[PDB]
Structures are given as structure tokens and as C-alpha cells.
Amino acid sequence: DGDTSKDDWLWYKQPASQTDATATAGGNYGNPDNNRWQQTTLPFGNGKIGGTVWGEVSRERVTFNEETLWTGGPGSSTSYNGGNNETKGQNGATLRALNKQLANGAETVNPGNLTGGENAAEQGNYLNWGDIYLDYGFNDTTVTEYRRDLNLSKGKADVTFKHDGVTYTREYFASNPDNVMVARLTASKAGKLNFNVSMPTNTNYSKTGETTTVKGDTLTVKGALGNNGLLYNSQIKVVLDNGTLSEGSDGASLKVSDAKAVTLYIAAATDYKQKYPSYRTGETAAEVNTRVAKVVQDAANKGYTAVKKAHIDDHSAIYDRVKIDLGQSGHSSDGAVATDALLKAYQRGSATTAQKRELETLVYKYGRYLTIGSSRENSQLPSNLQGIWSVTAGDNAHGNTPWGSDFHMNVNLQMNYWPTYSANMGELAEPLIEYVEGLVKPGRVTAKVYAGAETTNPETTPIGEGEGYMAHTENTAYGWTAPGQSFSWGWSPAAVPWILQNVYEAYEYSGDPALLDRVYALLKEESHFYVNYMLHKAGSSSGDRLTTGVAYSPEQGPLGTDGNTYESSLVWQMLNDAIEAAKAKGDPDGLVGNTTDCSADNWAKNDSGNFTDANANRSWSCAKSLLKPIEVGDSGQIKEWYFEGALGKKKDGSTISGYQADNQHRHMSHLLGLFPGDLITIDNSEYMDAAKTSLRYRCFKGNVLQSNTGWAIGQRINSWARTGDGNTTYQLVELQLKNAMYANLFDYHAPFQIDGNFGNTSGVDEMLLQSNSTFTDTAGKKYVNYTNILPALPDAWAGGSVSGLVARGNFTVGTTWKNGKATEVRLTSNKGKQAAVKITAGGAQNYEVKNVNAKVVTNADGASLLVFDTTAGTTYTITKK
Ligand SMILES: C[C@@H]1NC[C@@H](O)[C@H](O)[C@@H]1O
Ligand SMILES: [Ca+2]
Ligand SMILES: [Ca+2]
Structure with missing residues (x-):
């Protein structure tokens, strides 16, 4: 390792099992062992496989993940169609009827029929793959000189202790260049390294035909998920330094005895492919097996030294x-404190200034580290609610894993990609761009079912040239673009506009013309979709403007209003960005238009949902100018709904049904124009005072700052930063570290949710x-x-x-x-x-x-x-x- 005194470390003087796990557990973590996992273990990964290290003395444990182990999708039923319900959508008639009721003056409508996604086995979820156990079989766990750490700078986890006169060390990392996980295990005296290695799959998901076998130096676990037939295969190849290797007596493990040092090469893969409609490579189980064996073989052929060097070079090139x-x-400071002890001192208010700046800068740095571990240029999928790291597993959605550890597009997935450009990790956004492109084919099915937008030749029609693609909040590996089975969380088509900000930003920060074309294609078709199928002249409840029709503000207030600030702010930003993208290309399609003969009356449609005037100005510039997303209410606040009066109330003084009565609603769906967007800014500051007012109500009761979920605090840090008020912004940083970080520095909701880790990194960038x-x-x-x-x-x-x-x-x-x-x-x-x-x-x-x-x-x-x-x-x- 050389001189590591300048490296960034999270470090602990005791195993995970003895580390404080006393913070709020949250839903799905009633089992003490799972709760211990999320609060105390240390994560690493290569964007595809990942580990979380316990650092146990005798029975060592690395909880194991691969990014594509997802239940649900094709093969989970004989009729999988992305959750789309044709009897609900009625090719857009259900939505059209609801919008007509709004346009005719209704304040709210019942959107209860705008649902889909009823079969939890089809929706599926992300699975914990299993664990690697390295059982040393010590008689007691009495040790001295114990340290475990995570070296953020070198992208590795380390364990050392002294047991009965012998020093044992462990090192773990997952290489992106060699696509392999590596465990380097050492004893200080020859003959003293003895352990059994096994890799049990999580016991809670159903399986078909799983076998665990040993051939020579290699342990293989392979099967098919019982939920959908997805093939999976993991392998551990155990390479003794130039000791003894035997098949474990259980026939399901390998036994290293009388050794001094060994390298384990670990690989895993499934036959997943992000390819609509089948979502499979087409490989057979023998083919996946051969593929995985070659990974560990190629790695072993290169050897420990060269694999480790290529890994640290790759990791640090981004991290540094x-x-x-x-x-x-930092960890080499006189009087340096362990990270759990640093956290506790910070929470109790005994941390010194230097210690406060250590936790603050470590949390910042960890958001960058965690992006590298979960989201690489060649990852098949973007970071999900937990990055790539989980201990929980079950077959069905809304089961054993909170919110399915899914792709949640009404704030969370966006927050995952907030620091990615500003913190100099732009290439790591690539799986998000591909993911959103991956929504176009299944989302054209949803667009057709729920909004009557049918793309003909949907397989050969390029992105940009279709009628529109629609997706909602809850998304998966398998084009689950349908709305949810309940409207009050499930229907949210502005999710697509919003994730297209993260995507457009890839070009905004790079100026790369290959990205320009990719983001232009997406914006062009989603803008067409909204202009032609989603927008309408508002009814009297929402004043004089185009709105998006039946809407819910995540996640509070009335169901089915005539638009809302959330959706209008988002569609404004999208049209804004689409116009910027078109300009940069010289507007080849003639879509920018102008505001000449521009009126909300241009959107009049007949009973069959077609524009009455084929020739009227419905250009992007015109539509954008008619949204008027922002209004100030009676309390000086940005209104969240257009019928809003005072804060949380209607114009006639009556409360807004379902408004979170304390003012602390976790979402601030109506302030997206301030952050991440460009609608309310320090320069275009007509509504900055109203934004600040809205923020104060959302964070404070009088002068007393209120706590919230880690992500809600992460959004608040970024939003306050955009206002210029660095002092208040910092109160939120501090609040996050005190109330929303476990001992392993995982952000929590509760439970562990990675969003707030990435929100922290972004929020600090926006300060500076x-x-x-x-x-x-x-x-x-x-x-x-x-x-x-x-x-x-x-x-x-x-x-x-x-x-x-x-x-x-x-x-x-x-x-x-x-x-x-x-x-x-x-x-x-x-x-x-x-x-x-x-x-x-x-x-x-x-x-x-x-x-x-x-x-x-x-x-x-x-x-x-x-x-x-x-x-x-x-x-x-x-x-x-
Ligand atoms: C993953 C969940 N998505 C909806 C949001 O309201 C919750 O707080 C969680 O973030
Ligand atoms: Ca991933
Ligand atoms: Ca912008």
C-alpha cells in the first residue's frame, strides 16, 4: 500500500457486530441483523458487483450484490406488459375525460382509474444476491490491534487484528477494468491462515435448479430466479500463493488450510439485458457459466499485483x-478519532472545528466514492435507491426490501445524479442516459394506453421521431413505465421531464456534440408528447394558462388538480432545454417557433382529442410562454397549487385537503424551478423572496430548524444553496449529519437510502x-x-x-x-x-x-x-x- 497517511478513510476500532447500530431502523429492518448491516458495514463496488464488509474476527462476512439481480419483468407472468392496464387507460379516453372535467371548472377530479402495475410479481424488485462467508473457526474472538477501514482514495476495504500472536489482514476491492472482486487474505506466520469460504445466496427469494459445486480451485453457485427465470452464476476462485486447498466437507465450500496468503477472485453475472421486450442476452446457463469462469481466470492470469494496480489507477483517476x-x-491526525466516534461527537456537539470539518468533508467525499462504486460508464443500470448495495431479498415488489430498492423518479433517482457533473464524474452519468433511452420503447406503450399517443413502427422509429414515451414514479430493470396501482404516489408523468434535466445536464456540462444529439432526440419526443397530448388550457381553478391537466403534487395535498407548480415548472424546464438543444443544432426541425399568434386557445381539441386548428401556433416557444409556472400566494409563498391562497389554504381560507399540517412536508415539489432548475435564480429573482419564504416554512417552526428524511434534507441543502444564503444552507448540512447518517455514513430515511448521500455532495458543490x-x-x-x-x-x-x-x-x-x-x-x-x-x-x-x-x-x-x-x-x- 505504501504511504496511505494522505488517503481518506472511514475507520473503526471494532467489527460491525460491535459498532453502534442504535439509530432509527426504519421499515423492513425489524430483524436486528439486517439493521446492523445497513448501519455498520462498509461498501465497495465496480458499478456492477458490490460488497459490504462486516470485518468480523472469526466468521468474516461480505454481503454480496450484482446490479442486475432483479425479479419481475418478462417471464414473471405469461402477459407481462410493463404494468400497463388497457381497461384503465382506454387509449387516452380516461385521461381526456378527466381533463375535460377540469377545463370545465372542476377544482379536483377523481383520478382513481389512472392506475396500472397491480401484479407485484411482475413489478419485481432488486435482490440482495447473498453473502461471502470466510469462516476462520477461531475458538474465541479475543483480539488486539483491531482496525477496519474503507480507503475512499484507493477504493478498497481493509481489516486487521492480532489473534493468539498472529496478525491477520484482509483487503477487498472490486475492479472495473478487470470486472472482478478481489479478496486478499494474509496471516503473519506460515501455516496460520485457515478458513472455509462459501457463498450462500439469500434464502428469501425463490429459486429454480440452484446448485453449489466445487471443481478444483473454484466454487460455483448457479440457478435461475424462481420469479422470472433470470439466470445467475457466481464464482469464487481461490489462488494460494506459490498451503492446502480442499473441498469443504459440506460439498458447498472450499477449505484453505495451513496457508499464509491467498487471493480470492470473485465474479458474478446474470443473463439480464436492457433490451425491450425480452430483457435477456439469449445466453444459455452454460454460456453464462463459461463467461463468469473466464472473468476469474483472466484475473488470476494477470495476478494480484497487476489487478490491484489497474484497479487503484482506475478508481483514483476519478476519485482524485x-x-x-x-x-x-483525518485518520493520520494526532488524536484522530474513529468515524463512529467522530459521528457521535458531532451529534452530541462535542466535536472540535477540525473534527466538524472532517465529518463534513468525509460525507461530501463519500457521495463521490459511492458514485464510483455504483455507477460506472459500463454499468448496465444506474444507481438504484441503495446504489448497488442491499442485504434484503424477496420475490415481489413492496415486500422484504423498502420501495423495492428501485428506480424512483419523483425525486430520488434525480438526486442520485445531482452531483455527478459538478463533482467531476460526468462519464458516470452514462448508465442514466442509457436507462432513460431504455424507457422510450416501453413508455410508448404507456403513452399509447394512457394518453392516446401511438407511435407506429415502434421498433424501428428512432428516439425523437415517435409520438411520446410516458413513465411514472416507480420504475424497474424491465420497462415498468406504467402508473402505480395507487394514484397518490403512482401517477406522475412529469417524472420523465424531470429525469431529462439530469440527462440534458450531461451536455450542458460537457458541450459534447454526441451527447447533444442524444439529449436533443429525447427532449424533442417528450416535448412533442407534452405539447400534443398532455397540455390543455386550464379551467377556472388554475387561472389563465396552459396546464398539464390531472395532477398530484408529490406527495401531499389534493388528488387530481388542474395542473400544479411541480408539473408546470418541470415542463417549462423541459421546453426550455429542448429549445436550447434545438438552437445548438441550428433548429433543423423548425420546432423552436416563436410567441406570435400565441394563445392557450391554440390547444382546443375536438371530442376525439385532435386539434381543432391544425395550423395554430403550438411551437415550443409558445407553449413555454403560456405555462406561467410561478405565482406568489397570500403568505408571500410560492404556490404549490394554482387555487392556493395562504400557505396550506385555498383562496376562501379553507385548508387544502391533505396538506401536511405542520409545515414540514418532505417533498418541495413546487420549488424545482429554484433547484435543480433555472426558473428562479439569483439573477431572475422576482420570485426569490417567495422561494425563501416557502423554504423557511418547509424547514423551520419559528426560529427552530426541523429535521426530516435524509433526502428531504439533501434537497433542502441544494435549494438553500441556490438562494445564496450560505449560513442557512450550512444549518441544513449540519442537520443532515446529525440526524440522517448512520455510523458507516450511509444516508437514512430511515432506512438506508443512498439518495441523501448524493444530495449532500451536490449541496456542497452548489455552496462553492x-x-x-x-x-x-x-x-x-x-x-x-x-x-x-x-x-x-x-x-x-x-x-x-x-x-x-x-x-x-x-x-x-x-x-x-x-x-x-x-x-x-x-x-x-x-x-x-x-x-x-x-x-x-x-x-x-x-x-x-x-x-x-x-x-x-x-x-x-x-x-x-x-x-x-x-x-x-x-x-x-x-x-x-
Ligand atoms: C423511496 C421513497 N419515495 C417516495 C418518497 O416520498 C419517500 O420519502 C421515499 O423517498
Ligand atoms: Ca449499477
Ligand atoms: Ca440548465
Whole structure:
């Protein structure tokens, strides 16, 4: 390992079984062992397989996952159709009738028939694969010199202790380049390494024809999921250093005896494929077997040293892109404390400043680490509710695993990909882009059933050229794009618009023309879908505007209103982004249009759902201009519903049915225009005071800050950051670390939900750098996606530095500050785009740039930007005059 004193570690002086697991367990974790798993174990992965290390003395345990072990989908029934219910949808007639009731003046309608997804065996869920047990068979677990750690920098978990005079060590990592999990096990005296290795599958999912067999140095477990026939195969190849290897007496394990060091190569795979409609590779069980055996064989052929080197090089190339120094201590500090002890001191308010900055920076860093472990460029699937890490397993949705550890697209999956670009991991978004592309074919079925949008030739019609694809909140590995069996969580077609922000951002941050074309195709077809099938002139309940028709605001208030701020803000952003994408391509399709002869009356349709006037302006620019997503209510708040009066009330003073009466609703579905969107910004700030008001009510009772789920706090951190109020933002960071982090630094809802880990990383980035807003100088000139240095810097962080953050337009950003003001900015232009740099903590007019002909422009607020041409590859240093 060499010098690891500068590496980032989570570290513990005792095994998981002796680590504090006393925080709220949450749903599905009533079993003490499962609860211990989520609070205390340490995760690693290669985007595809993953482990969670217990670090037990005698019976060591690594809980094992592979990303595609999903029940549900084709083969789970003889009629799997993505959950779509034709009798419910009626080819769009059910929705059309409901929207007509709204347009005619209803405030609410009963959307109870807009459901699908009734068979929980078809929906399925993500499964814990099983565990690897390394049973040392010690007579007692008495040890000294015990440490377990996770080295975030090298992308490995370590265990060491001394037992009866002998030092045992363990090291675990999962290589992306060699697609293999590695366990390096050592004893300090020859002959003293003795253990049994087995890999039991989780006992709670049904199985068909599973066998566990040993041939030579290799243990193989293989079967088919009883729920859907999915083939699975895992293998452990045990390579003794140049000791004894025997078949375990149970015939289901391997026995290493009288050894000193061994390397285990672990691989696993299924025959899953993200390929509609079959979702299989077509391999036979023998083929998957051969494939998996070759993985471990190729790895062994390369050998431990070379595999480990290629892994650390691969991991660290991404992990080391970003450095942050807020004055933290670390594991090699005098008086360094273990991570569980750090957490406890932080929660009790006894942590020193250096210790507070250690936990804060470790949590930040862990969100980046966790992206690398769960979401690689070659992962078949994006990160799910738990990344890739789980201990729970059952056959059916809404079963033994909370929310199926699924792809949840009414905030959670989005939050997973909030830090991915700004924290310099842009390539790791690729599985999300492919996933969303993967929704187009099944979602055209949903679009046709529920909105009457039928794409002909749905198999050969390219993305961008269809009539629309529709998906809702709960999604899976298998194009489960139907609405849920209950509307009040299940129906949410704006999920697609919203996840298309995360996708569009891949181009916004890179300027890559291959991405431009991919994101343009998606936006074009989803915009067409909404303009042609979803939008209508509102009824009297929602005033004068286009709305999206029957809607629910996740996840509170009335069912089936005439649009809402959530859906309008989202559709506005989508049309915004679609227009930007079209412009960048020279508008080849002529879809941008204009606001000429533009009216909500342009959307009039006949009884059969076709536009009355074929020639009327329904262009993207027109539609966008008619949404008017934002209104301020009687309490000075952003309204969540257009019939809103005061906060939580209707115009006539009556409460809004189902509004969460304390004001602490976890979702803030009506503030998406502030974060992640570009609708309410520090520049376009007509509604910033109302946004802040709304935020205060959502987080505070008087002057007392309220707690919430980890993800709800993660959204609040990001939203406060966009306001510029760095002090309040930081109160939320602190609240998250005190109330929503287990001892292993897993974010919790409860239970463990990874969303809030990625929300934390994003929220910190947004404190130090923003790049989403548009500046308008006093001459009227526009600077779109300008680089905003230290926009929400808390007084708690008076000095520090960060390097390697990414701004839209593709600029890498480093900044150092002291006494609350930037002392240096380093701006690397990766694409040659003109720079426009605001310095919120210091004022850009007070700085000069070197490599430079930089002009200062000012807005009516008195805010200044530095503006200068750049060359791709060049870094510009900005310092105070
Ligand atoms: C996964 C679940 N999705 C819906 C949300 O309201 C819950 O709080 C969880 O995040
Ligand atoms: Ca994955
Ligand atoms: Ca944007």
C-alpha cells in the first residue's frame, strides 16, 4: 500500500457486530441483523458487483450484490406488459375525460382509474444476491490491534487484528477494468491462515435448479430466479500463493488450510439485458457459466499485483479529480478519532472545528466514492435507491426490501445524479442516459394506453421521431413505465421531464456534440408528447394558462388538480432545454417557433382529442410562454397549487385537503424551478423572496430548524444553496449529519437510502460553485450559464480551498478563499467557450485575470462579471487587484 497517511478513510476500532447500530431502523429492518448491516458495514463496488464488509474476527462476512439481480419483468407472468392496464387507460379516453372535467371548472377530479402495475410479481424488485462467508473457526474472538477501514482514495476495504500472536489482514476491492472482486487474505506466520469460504445466496427469494459445486480451485453457485427465470452464476476462485486447498466437507465450500496468503477472485453475472421486450442476452446457463469462469481466470492470469494496480489507477483517476480542504483533521491526525466516534461527537456537539470539518468533508467525499462504486460508464443500470448495495431479498415488489430498492423518479433517482457533473464524474452519468433511452420503447406503450399517443413502427422509429414515451414514479430493470396501482404516489408523468434535466445536464456540462444529439432526440419526443397530448388550457381553478391537466403534487395535498407548480415548472424546464438543444443544432426541425399568434386557445381539441386548428401556433416557444409556472400566494409563498391562497389554504381560507399540517412536508415539489432548475435564480429573482419564504416554512417552526428524511434534507441543502444564503444552507448540512447518517455514513430515511448521500455532495458543490443561471447586464446582454464562484459560502467556513469542480460550458474550477472572500480562482477552459465569471464572495470587479483582455460588465443589482475569450486546455488564474 505504501504511504496511505494522505488517503481518506472511514475507520473503526471494532467489527460491525460491535459498532453502534442504535439509530432509527426504519421499515423492513425489524430483524436486528439486517439493521446492523445497513448501519455498520462498509461498501465497495465496480458499478456492477458490490460488497459490504462486516470485518468480523472469526466468521468474516461480505454481503454480496450484482446490479442486475432483479425479479419481475418478462417471464414473471405469461402477459407481462410493463404494468400497463388497457381497461384503465382506454387509449387516452380516461385521461381526456378527466381533463375535460377540469377545463370545465372542476377544482379536483377523481383520478382513481389512472392506475396500472397491480401484479407485484411482475413489478419485481432488486435482490440482495447473498453473502461471502470466510469462516476462520477461531475458538474465541479475543483480539488486539483491531482496525477496519474503507480507503475512499484507493477504493478498497481493509481489516486487521492480532489473534493468539498472529496478525491477520484482509483487503477487498472490486475492479472495473478487470470486472472482478478481489479478496486478499494474509496471516503473519506460515501455516496460520485457515478458513472455509462459501457463498450462500439469500434464502428469501425463490429459486429454480440452484446448485453449489466445487471443481478444483473454484466454487460455483448457479440457478435461475424462481420469479422470472433470470439466470445467475457466481464464482469464487481461490489462488494460494506459490498451503492446502480442499473441498469443504459440506460439498458447498472450499477449505484453505495451513496457508499464509491467498487471493480470492470473485465474479458474478446474470443473463439480464436492457433490451425491450425480452430483457435477456439469449445466453444459455452454460454460456453464462463459461463467461463468469473466464472473468476469474483472466484475473488470476494477470495476478494480484497487476489487478490491484489497474484497479487503484482506475478508481483514483476519478476519485482524485476533486480535492477539498476546509481545515479538517483525518485518520493520520494526532488524536484522530474513529468515524463512529467522530459521528457521535458531532451529534452530541462535542466535536472540535477540525473534527466538524472532517465529518463534513468525509460525507461530501463519500457521495463521490459511492458514485464510483455504483455507477460506472459500463454499468448496465444506474444507481438504484441503495446504489448497488442491499442485504434484503424477496420475490415481489413492496415486500422484504423498502420501495423495492428501485428506480424512483419523483425525486430520488434525480438526486442520485445531482452531483455527478459538478463533482467531476460526468462519464458516470452514462448508465442514466442509457436507462432513460431504455424507457422510450416501453413508455410508448404507456403513452399509447394512457394518453392516446401511438407511435407506429415502434421498433424501428428512432428516439425523437415517435409520438411520446410516458413513465411514472416507480420504475424497474424491465420497462415498468406504467402508473402505480395507487394514484397518490403512482401517477406522475412529469417524472420523465424531470429525469431529462439530469440527462440534458450531461451536455450542458460537457458541450459534447454526441451527447447533444442524444439529449436533443429525447427532449424533442417528450416535448412533442407534452405539447400534443398532455397540455390543455386550464379551467377556472388554475387561472389563465396552459396546464398539464390531472395532477398530484408529490406527495401531499389534493388528488387530481388542474395542473400544479411541480408539473408546470418541470415542463417549462423541459421546453426550455429542448429549445436550447434545438438552437445548438441550428433548429433543423423548425420546432423552436416563436410567441406570435400565441394563445392557450391554440390547444382546443375536438371530442376525439385532435386539434381543432391544425395550423395554430403550438411551437415550443409558445407553449413555454403560456405555462406561467410561478405565482406568489397570500403568505408571500410560492404556490404549490394554482387555487392556493395562504400557505396550506385555498383562496376562501379553507385548508387544502391533505396538506401536511405542520409545515414540514418532505417533498418541495413546487420549488424545482429554484433547484435543480433555472426558473428562479439569483439573477431572475422576482420570485426569490417567495422561494425563501416557502423554504423557511418547509424547514423551520419559528426560529427552530426541523429535521426530516435524509433526502428531504439533501434537497433542502441544494435549494438553500441556490438562494445564496450560505449560513442557512450550512444549518441544513449540519442537520443532515446529525440526524440522517448512520455510523458507516450511509444516508437514512430511515432506512438506508443512498439518495441523501448524493444530495449532500451536490449541496456542497452548489455552496462553492453554481453555473446554471443567466446574467443580464445593464446593456441587455445575456451571459447564459455563467460561472458563479462561492455563491452560498457559510461563515462557518471562513477559509478553505476546493479544486476540480465542473461548471456548465465545460470549465474545471478551483477556488481558494480566506476571511470569507476568494483569494484565487483557477478556471480551466476545456472547450474554448467564452468565460463569464461572477465572484459572489469578493466581487469580480475587484479581481484581474492572468494566463488577459478581460472586461467587467455589471447588472442593475450592481453585480459584476469578468468576461474573456478562452482557449481549450488553458487555465486562467483570477486574483484580487
Ligand atoms: C423511496 C421513497 N419515495 C417516495 C418518497 O416520498 C419517500 O420519502 C421515499 O423517498
Ligand atoms: Ca449499477
Ligand atoms: Ca440548465
